[PDB]
Design a protein around this ligand. Structure first.
Ligand SMILES: *[P@@](=O)(CCCCCCCCCCOC(=O)NCCCCCC#C)OCC
Ligand SMILES: [Cl-]
Length: 161
């Protein structure tokens, strides 16, 4: 699937779904997840509680409450196991699989930087990029970045080559 890189707040993404990097317990905290709790509202954690624990590397879908998307796809990158390039690969693939199963088109990711600080950044980018590339072209992916400088850096890299 194609990806477009933009600056923004993923909780303002208007489209079919946002991907939420998660622990496998599916319990939300601060950061992007905190914005989801607040802006999405109580139904998101309530539905996560109804799903219960999943395995690291899997994904699970909830509604999105008052967010401007239909679904939140929670992608379990760590929790009862530490993050690894393998868990990143599996969680990205699993999140995309859920989007395909739901018949979605537009899906947003963050860089997952705040979940992968112990892993080589270039490798994380490669593995996520590879899984997104392999996903069907029925999906259109948006990468949402905190700063314009960084969003543009991702765009420039997408040219070369
Ligand atoms: P910023 O703070 C960091 C700039 C990093 C530039 C990256 C260049 C190579 C990336 C190759 C592909 O990356 C991806 O495919 N990553 C996965 C998909 C996107 C995730 C969603 C996001 C958001 O700027 C400072 C100069
Ligand atoms: Cl994040």
């Amino acid at each position: 699937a194609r990806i477009r890189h933009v600056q923004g707040d993923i909780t303002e993404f208007q489209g079919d779904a946002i991907v939420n990097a998660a622990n496998n317990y599916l319990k939300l905290g601060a950061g992007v997840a905190g914005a989801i709790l607040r802006k999405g509202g109580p139904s998101i954690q309530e539905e996560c509680d109804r799903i219960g624990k999943i395995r690291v590397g899997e994904a699970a879908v909830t509604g999105a409450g008052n967010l401007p998307v239909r679904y939140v796809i929670h992608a379990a990158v760590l929790g009862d196991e530490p993050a690894s390039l393998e868990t990143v690969r599996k969680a990205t693939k699993s999140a995309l699989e859920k989007a395909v199963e739901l018949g979605l088109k537009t899906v947003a990711f963050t860089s997952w930087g705040a979940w992968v600080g112990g892993l080589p950044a270039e490798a994380v980018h490669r593995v996520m990029g590879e899984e997104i590339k392999k996903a069907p072209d029925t999906l259109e992916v948006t990468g949402v970045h905190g700063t314009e400088k960084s969003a543009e850096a991702y765009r420039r890299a997408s040219l070369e080559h």
